[PDB]
Design a binder for this molecule. Sequence first.
Ligand SMILES: *[C@@H]1O[C@H](CO)[C@@H](O)[C@H](O)[C@H]1NC(C)=O
Ligand SMILES: *[C@@H]1O[C@H](CO)[C@@H](O)[C@H](O)[C@H]1NC(C)=O
Ligand SMILES: *[C@@H]1O[C@H](CO)[C@@H](O)[C@H](O)[C@H]1NC(C)=O
Ligand SMILES: *[C@@H]1O[C@H](CO)[C@@H](O)[C@H](O)[C@H]1NC(C)=O
Ligand SMILES: *[C@@H]1O[C@H](CO)[C@@H](O)[C@H](O)[C@H]1NC(C)=O
Ligand SMILES: [Ca+2]
Ligand SMILES: [Ca+2]
Ligand SMILES: [Ca+2]
Ligand SMILES: [Ca+2]
Ligand SMILES: [Ca+2]
Ligand SMILES: [Ca+2]
Ligand SMILES: [Ca+2]
Ligand SMILES: [Ca+2]
Ligand SMILES: [Ca+2]
Ligand SMILES: [Ca+2]
Ligand SMILES: [Ca+2]
Ligand SMILES: [Ca+2]
Lengths: 48, 533, 265, 272, 265, 272
Amino acid sequence: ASLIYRQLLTNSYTVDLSDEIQEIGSTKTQNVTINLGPFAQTGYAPVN
Amino acid sequence: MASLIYRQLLTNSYTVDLSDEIQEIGSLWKEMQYNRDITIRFKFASSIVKSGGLGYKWSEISFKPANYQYTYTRDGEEVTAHTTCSVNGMNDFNFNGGSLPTDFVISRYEVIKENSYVYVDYWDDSQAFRNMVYVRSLAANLNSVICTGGDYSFALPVGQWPVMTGGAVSLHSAGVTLSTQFTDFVSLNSLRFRFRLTVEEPSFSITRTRVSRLYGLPAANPNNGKEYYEVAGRFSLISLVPSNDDYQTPITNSVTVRQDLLGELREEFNALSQEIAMSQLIDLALLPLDMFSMFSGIKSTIDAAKSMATSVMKKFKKSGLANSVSTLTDSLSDAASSISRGASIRSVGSSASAWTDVSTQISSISTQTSTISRRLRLKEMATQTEGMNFDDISAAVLKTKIDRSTQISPNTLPDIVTEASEKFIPNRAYRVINNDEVFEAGTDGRFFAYRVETFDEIPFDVQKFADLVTDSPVISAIIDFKTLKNLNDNYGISRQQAFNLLRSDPRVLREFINQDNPIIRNRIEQLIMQCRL
Amino acid sequence: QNYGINLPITGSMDTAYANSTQEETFLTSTLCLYYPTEAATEINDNSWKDTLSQLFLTKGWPTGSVYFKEYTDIASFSVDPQLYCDYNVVLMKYDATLQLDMSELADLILNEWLCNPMDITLYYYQQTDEANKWISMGSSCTIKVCPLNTQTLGIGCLTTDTATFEEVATAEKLVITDVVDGVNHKLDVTTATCTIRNCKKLGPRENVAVIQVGGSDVLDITADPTTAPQTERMMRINWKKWWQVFYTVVDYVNQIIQAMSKRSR
Amino acid sequence: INLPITGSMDTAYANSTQEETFLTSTLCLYYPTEAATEINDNSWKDTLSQLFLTKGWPTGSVYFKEYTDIASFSVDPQLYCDYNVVLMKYDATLQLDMSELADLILNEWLCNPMDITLYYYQQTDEANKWISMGSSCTIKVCPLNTQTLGIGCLTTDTATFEEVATAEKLVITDVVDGVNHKLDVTTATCTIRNCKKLGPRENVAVIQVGGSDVLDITADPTTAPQTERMMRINWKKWWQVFYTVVDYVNQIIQAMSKRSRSLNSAAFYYRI
Amino acid sequence: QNYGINLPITGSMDTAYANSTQEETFLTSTLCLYYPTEAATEINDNSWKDTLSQLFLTKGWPTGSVYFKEYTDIASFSVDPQLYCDYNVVLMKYDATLQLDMSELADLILNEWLCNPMDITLYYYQQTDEANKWISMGSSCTIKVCPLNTQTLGIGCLTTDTATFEEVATAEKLVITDVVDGVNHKLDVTTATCTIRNCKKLGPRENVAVIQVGGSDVLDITADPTTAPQTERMMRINWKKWWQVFYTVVDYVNQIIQAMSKRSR
Amino acid sequence: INLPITGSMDTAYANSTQEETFLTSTLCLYYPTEAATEINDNSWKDTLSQLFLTKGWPTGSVYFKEYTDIASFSVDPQLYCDYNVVLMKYDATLQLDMSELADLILNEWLCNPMDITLYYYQQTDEANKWISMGSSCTIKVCPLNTQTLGIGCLTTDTATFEEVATAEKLVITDVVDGVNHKLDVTTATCTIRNCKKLGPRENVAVIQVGGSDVLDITADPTTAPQTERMMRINWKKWWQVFYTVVDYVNQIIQAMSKRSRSLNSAAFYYRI
Ligand SMILES: *[C@@H]1O[C@H](CO)[C@@H](O)[C@H](O)[C@H]1NC(C)=O
Ligand SMILES: *[C@@H]1O[C@H](CO)[C@@H](O)[C@H](O)[C@H]1NC(C)=O
Ligand SMILES: *[C@@H]1O[C@H](CO)[C@@H](O)[C@H](O)[C@H]1NC(C)=O
Ligand SMILES: *[C@@H]1O[C@H](CO)[C@@H](O)[C@H](O)[C@H]1NC(C)=O
Ligand SMILES: *[C@@H]1O[C@H](CO)[C@@H](O)[C@H](O)[C@H]1NC(C)=O
Ligand SMILES: [Ca+2]
Ligand SMILES: [Ca+2]
Ligand SMILES: [Ca+2]
Ligand SMILES: [Ca+2]
Ligand SMILES: [Ca+2]
Ligand SMILES: [Ca+2]
Ligand SMILES: [Ca+2]
Ligand SMILES: [Ca+2]
Ligand SMILES: [Ca+2]
Ligand SMILES: [Ca+2]
Ligand SMILES: [Ca+2]
Ligand SMILES: [Ca+2]
């Protein structure tokens, strides 16, 4: 009755294509490069 | 081994669930030689949908399927061809200058990148595209194309124009499948290729905005004024034209098949049953004919080669065999757990054992023996046996018939494998040995107790046969007591040969079958003729 | 599971060496850097903390284990420090004019002190051994001390006239005072701004590690002038930038955590 | 220490460690401003010290630490002495506050910080609670379901959340241990910490000066214990209270014991 | 004479100590000093070299075995130091602002580096051990690094905008960079006026001898911030003139050469 | 090392040193500017790197060091790599130049400086030559006799000296071994060194891209040998030359062997 453990370990490659299924089924979302960076404390010219 | 194949089907049943998931989220013979040349001229389309207001904002710049119909030369004949190009899996960007009505906004516009895939259905009036109804293999080698985006100006009634420019991707051919074009009265069978996209140097940009150095191809002007993009190559295709006595090769493939519907498949099996030999069958009934070796010699069709094992499995786990197995396991579990409120139906033996729980009785000892023997069929594909393991012979007959039988098909082999597994050797006997005392039993309500050395019957000790068959290993009745005693009488037999026949050893079995022993040939022929379907 | 008891232990020498507890102590511990604002200023970036964490991730330290806690100045840090992690690293800038201040900070954090309070206005205090020092933290401490004689009169000072006292600290944020051991002192302290505590020095703290980023090693942990030692968790670098210093810390973190060991207490 | 200890019942009862613990320990009282106000004296501390000096406690061992109010004291109490006594005035309107104070000081907490905005936390066992300190704490919580959505509240509308504390300086919060909560706390004015309750702190001694014994340390309403170091006086003055404390200080220290875990100045341990 | 191989050596403990190879090694070897221009400037003599040579002649070193090789400044010396002699001495002035450069000089000459080239336009480089550093020589090196992740993307930097890179050097004539070992770095360098080389620190060079002339010992040869060692051929002196320094060197040239040992490679 | 080594002929030993270094090799090509000129590409270095990757060499192991001309390369050739390949074009008017370059890089030299003015030097064996490098080296030599006078020349009139180098950058001069010579060299623009030839440098490999084998590495005219690491090619384009080198680099590398004496960057050792 250890055949479950043995077959699970053996057939663990199927999880990869199961993840593939769940991925191609689920939605997608990608992000962009963002900046925190240095930002200058820039005001306006002295106007009249 | 030949029962290991059934055990493996049951084990690998878990793939049927994901196969059905994939299918859901998606939704004599001869050979003819394509590997013909083709040139695919196609193009994209666009779908632009603007919003109201003052005219500064768009709500969609998306792709759209695009047909095309042209003519070209091949092997000296002008052939009229027809393509249909579409895309899938694109990145939807958006630009937004503000919430005011006068700020440039593109709420959504599509761009195809390396994570996208384009499909180009193709068709022409040649002979291949009417002969490709039964395919054995398909694969194509095509050159690549580089498709670049052109200048596109947004019609702003006031101010300066935004200019969409740049952008380019490379299509290389990767993947060929079949498809259909649906006309008004008939249908056309077509061949759709899949090109993968590889981004290239020219970076798309939107002038007078904060968008630049953005690669890909959008839907604004993908063709850059080009009437079409053109790839060129060869497509390799094998056919399964149902030809006949070796002349009159069809054209247009000139056939219908059994899709118009077993009544005659059973007759084919009952014609192929007895032609089977015995020595070679026993040589084949010892081989672990796992999924590959069982499904290799079938010259399948392009869809059956992809789903044959799963196809038979999704029906094999619907049958009396599988349901009885699950019932037995549930009975064992509930017996090991329910003891406090223990199911007290019956126990012919020392203590309660799910293998020895008579039920559904619609002689008493005969009934008990038959009921206990209807679970040794489960012992067979539970690996607690010692001998030729009758399901193994059944599977050998199956593998020896489905390599000859002309009538084998994708919808057809499923539930044939199961009807075989269920109706091959319906009545079958088993034995257990204990201190040189053999207790037999059979599902036909027959029992025989007898000593090994000197075959002479004995009262059948029930409540001991059960205590032994429960835990001790079991053996099969290929050489059952009647024939065994006939043999020991007429064809005088030695101690070792008798022990090996009790253990059902293929060596001694095939040695008798080669010594031409009719008292074994008749029994094996009976087993064959029972493996009839 | 006995607590508060010191029992004899026993072992052997034919016992073999176990495996490397590194690559597990990293995952099951926490690390806290203490950098000066000049570092962030020179760097002129806002993703450098996440960058260093992604680097550490290649050394074994996971994302939510490393922390960077800023301190504007040595003295501001010295004002009531609270180092509560499982591994502390401190990057100390060198300054000749802050030598004793950043020696007292080291003597405070590197070592472990058992502290009782002090009520100047009521009692007259004394030191018993060479470990019972007086540590005063606050915004500006101005301490003065008068030693007394057998009959609780002053010695070169007047118990009444506070100005006759002997000023030992002038407007300091952290003072560690060792005075003559065996006499009763009377103190004047700006208690409105500074809190003073009678603290006995216990064994060292093995959880923190000071790193003098600049000049020669000057830290004199031991108040006594004879020893002037240097321990394993008192490091030194030479610097012209700070990215290089943080890269060095990262690349040789395992050496640092080998030089350090979790706290006994 | 994981090793064992061994002993014998034939050994002798050794001499009294009292009259030496008094010399090598320190004592620290926590009295309210009301007491000094009623007394109207300036040398009462030196008085009490000279009185302790008869009971054995030497001159520079006794300390007095004023606390304006129970809540101001519960805000980050830093008990750093080898023996602590607290005199605590009863008030029905402050019952839960002076019970949370008791649960905080009498016991030994092991605290980790809590980041509300980026993460969400849950309690595991009946000893893992959320304690918040500051000038004005206001805590709202929404428990979530298996699929990360609210339960009778909306993840966005903070008003939908369930208010457990309002305008409190110290709050000890115990929620259903096994669900994920989303919090709303005045982080600018109150810091909150996930603290596990270890064994008790034998170094402090609470003395309720007025009303009956009501403190329910153990949050479960099934023990309602009365520990040894949880005392009660009845008062009409403060001089009689202090004289009583001084005359029965030996019993108090017999009811207390120096800490076992480690040295630390605050009311809890920190482990990040 | 099996070169290119390494074989087990053997000996004994009964053999007697042989004669003093001094008074022969001086004759069959050469000694090169490296002094700063300030020395000859202060001196203002044309025959000081012949003077020191006639003085060495008393210690045993013959006339044409001694060599003097000037250098205007520590950085101009750090720019491609080519030490080709049998015993090298290097007199080094102290400057708290030059500490890192005069420690890099030490880490470069005291040791023996195995240096492979580098090409930044094509490849992205990573370090393998803790002794595989990047040494940059030239007139003004401005080095910037951007570490990459597993999938060839920056960490707090972008692989196009060189301004977002992380700066470790700024117009230095000699630089020695160590980074996190296990991550690929993209580099920006002033290739026109600087050459960078990826070098592995092998065992030390026993052929040179640095003599600091002024301040306290600060040189941290080992890049790791745990050792801070003081090697045997790392000497210190306190100075007010230069003639006294040269007389000291000449009088104690035997201890110097005993601290040094003819090279292996 | 002086000690001996042993062996056998039956064994299959398999026991050998294993260690690490820079990553198991390095390689450096020395190609002429003409090649990149003809190619007119700015990605061919990366192309060749990814090609070599098929032969096994990882990304950061192959390097290219462009050299404008044979003479410019001969002027201080600084090779510091674990394998060096030198593509070299044929020019019948440069035979001596591209044989001196070969005799310099293929062989290992031990060089001492020389002071022309203060001293008069001589050669001892058939391997003690005089190599001069610079921008324009015009050398002149006067042999001398037992009585320190000249022979067909005058110690004063430099015009009487015998000329051996005219407008050469690299010169390898061999003169009669066993007599004192007086030299006149453009010391402002060239440096001359008394060098001794040692065992060969197995780390470099010359590849004559063009005409037949001409390189007489051995100054003696009797040998005229040709070593395993002295290759020839016939060329009409450069892409094909580089593809050939890459397809057959494993044979080049089987012909080259890492150094034995020591590490060094130049083409000769300095020993004063
Ligand atoms: C019947 O089968 C036998 C052997 O199985 C074969 O020889 C014979 O030809 C078959 N009969 C017909 C009519 O084909
Ligand atoms: C023992 O340590 C080595 C070195 O870190 C490691 O590779 C190995 O996995 C360790 N053993 C076990 C059982 O983890
Ligand atoms: C303990 O008390 C007893 C009784 O007063 C006394 O005799 C004994 O001396 C005390 N122990 C010590 C160590 O003095
Ligand atoms: C070794 O030294 C001794 C003592 O100076 C001397 O007598 C002896 O001659 C030396 N050996 C040789 C070989 O000169
Ligand atoms: C090399 O190893 C083999 C097996 O490990 C051994 O038999 C052989 O003796 C070894 N070589 C030598 C020289 O000992
Ligand atoms: Ca100070
Ligand atoms: Ca002291
Ligand atoms: Ca005074
Ligand atoms: Ca409260
Ligand atoms: Ca609600
Ligand atoms: Ca709880
Ligand atoms: Ca420098
Ligand atoms: Ca490193
Ligand atoms: Ca950056
Ligand atoms: Ca030449
Ligand atoms: Ca002449
Ligand atoms: Ca010669």
